[PDB]
Symmetry: D2
Subunit: 100 residues, 4 copies
Amino acid sequence: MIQRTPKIQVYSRHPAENGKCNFLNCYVSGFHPSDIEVDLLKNGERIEKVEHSDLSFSKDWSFYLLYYTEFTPTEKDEYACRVNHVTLSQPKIVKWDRDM
Amino acid sequence: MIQRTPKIQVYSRHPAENGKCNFLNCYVSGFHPSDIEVDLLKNGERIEKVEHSDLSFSKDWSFYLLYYTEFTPTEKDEYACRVNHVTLSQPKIVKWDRDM
Amino acid sequence: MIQRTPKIQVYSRHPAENGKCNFLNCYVSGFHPSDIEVDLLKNGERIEKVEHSDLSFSKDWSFYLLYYTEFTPTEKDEYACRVNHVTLSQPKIVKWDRDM
Amino acid sequence: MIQRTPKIQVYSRHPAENGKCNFLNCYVSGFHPSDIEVDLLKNGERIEKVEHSDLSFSKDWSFYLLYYTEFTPTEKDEYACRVNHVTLSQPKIVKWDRDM
Ligand code: NA
Ligand code: NA
């Protein structure tokens, strides 16, 4: 099928509270082809190697992937999701907005 | 990920009986990349009615697909599954064996 | 959780055409508890073969079950679905309407 | 279908480390009927009200459910899963073993 650029959404499972265990999610959706490089960053640095969830699926040849890690939010730490695909000229970085 | 040739299996859901409504299946498994051409054939012509399940994937990026159609078997008619992929030099035809 | 009466829908997978192999379905939805008796009838007589899907439930504990069989529709034959549950006083019979 | 007692398994998603955000799972499997009361305890007291995962399913009228919460393991704290079902005379408590 024809190439399609992924939509990237970065969010925490529950409202962020410093010192309270949570899980950070990077949902990459509606893309084609499947070959994708997804990394979760903590202060511009990759945390642990995590692959797509079992909840991840395919619909009308397009791909819908979810990557998640458990984390304790802190005041000075900055979180982001780095995504690289054939449809992108350079790797895209989507920052995590605590207020969203 | 690296290229992987599909395993092709052609079978009817229930033991074949002439004049008795059944379901013909073509199960293509353990392949990479996802782009695949799958068509169910009846003698000369291609069955232009064939449906498919959703494209399912493993953690190791191997794809699984099931193509199916409702059919009434008959002693004279010959059924087959034509599969084309990047790993194949020419389209592979797997005939349906009523006895297996 | 509290008792909930099932919604019964009887339909063929594709629009009915005499002599053309199809699937007759009986979709029992939004019920509680899970224990249910579902039978497909051909001219008031119960079809022996009858297959069923896996039991599916919502986060709120309502059940969704699908009962199906391969069939060839004919002009002279009448189809129905007999459903029995704790919420029903007597078994409910839902006739198959070809035009619905 | 006939009554079947659940098999209860309590485990953390990753090897336990004090002060490191994790997931505490309680997998209740192969039970019938569906009506079940599952609570995760911290020193004999319930945590936040947790519903079953979307990975939860049904197989041959039996039920397979997964309940999970965030949590940060600490040295003093004891974790357990309290399960109540019709097949049990009194609520069963399965303690979390860090080494299992
Ligand atoms: Na903001
Ligand atoms: Na009508």
